[PDB]
Amino acid sequence: GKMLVVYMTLGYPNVQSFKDFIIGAVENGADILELGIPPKYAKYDGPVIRKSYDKVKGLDIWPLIEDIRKDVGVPIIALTYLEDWVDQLENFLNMIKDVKLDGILFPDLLIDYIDDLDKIDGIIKNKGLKNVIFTSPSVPDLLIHKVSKISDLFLYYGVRPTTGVPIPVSVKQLINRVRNLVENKLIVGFGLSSESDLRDALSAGADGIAIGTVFIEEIERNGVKSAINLVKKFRAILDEY
Ligand SMILES: [Cl-]
């Protein structure tokens, strides 16, 4: 079947409500968790991700990661910029394995560290960790093909960002043009998540979808239990395929 990947900003909105959402999300069918590590600097994050980072400013991040690791048994991927840890890439990857997370996803890996790709994949893989590689429409087709054969768990393909203007092309067509390039499992991630966009990706052959900002929005406007119920809804939609 199809994989439901659920993102949440570590500690958002508060520590107790964050664990409630994660546990509820996993109970309602999340297959993979992505946890957003608040960034040491500003980068390619949109308005609603940034505001989620604002509300957990100064969070003690490692005890919470440890804590949530004890609470749920699904694969957990750390979402953080290779930027914030390239100075210290060794004590980061050891800490990640120390607290028992399954892998990482560096969004800026293929952008700002493309020449370091093969070294960094090698080190991650020889720590037993998963290197989940981020791609997007601006990643050239042959690079996408390259990383599709090395990406662990799945290759991630991000469309519909909250920042900027979306590509005025149907998600069905966008995924049609990468599905045959990706030998891996293909997870399509969304900033804006219309149901039409999600069904377009699944019907175009994506092996799952990743969603996150939709949950941050639903929490702020209707609360954690409402956001948990959205997970149930997305699970049912993926279960139609
Ligand atoms: Cl797009």
Nearest to 46 by CA among 59, 33, 36: 36
Q: Which parts of the chain fold into alpha helices (H)?
A: 15-27, 47-55, 61-71, 83-86, 89-98, 109-112, 117-125, 141-148, 171-179, 195-203, 213-222, 224-238
Count: domains in the chain: 1
Torsion, CA 9, CA 129, CA 71, CA 135, rounded to 10: 30
* CA triple 110-162-51, angle to 5 deg: 100
Active site residue 98: no
Which range marks the domain in which residue 233 is found? 1-241
Active site residue 115: no
- 119 CA from centroid of ligand 1 (Å): 30
Catalytic hit among 20, 27, 31, 45: 45
DSSP assignments along 120-160, one per residue: HHHHHHTTT-EE--EE-TTS-HHHHHHHHTT-SS-EEEEES
Catalytic hit among 20, 27, 31, 34: 34
- 45 CA from centroid of ligand 1 (Å): 15
- 159 CA from centroid of ligand 1 (Å): 4
**What is the experimental method?**
X-ray
Nearest to 134 by CA among 125, 115, 121, 147: 147
One-letter amino acid of 43: K
Contact 186, 154 (CB under 8 A): yes
Contact 188, 4 (CB under 8 A): no
Q: CB pairs under 8 A, 24+ apart, for 66-71?
A: 66/99, 66/100, 67/19, 68/18, 68/19, 68/22, 68/33, 68/35, 69/99, 69/100, 69/101, 71/19, 71/22, 71/23
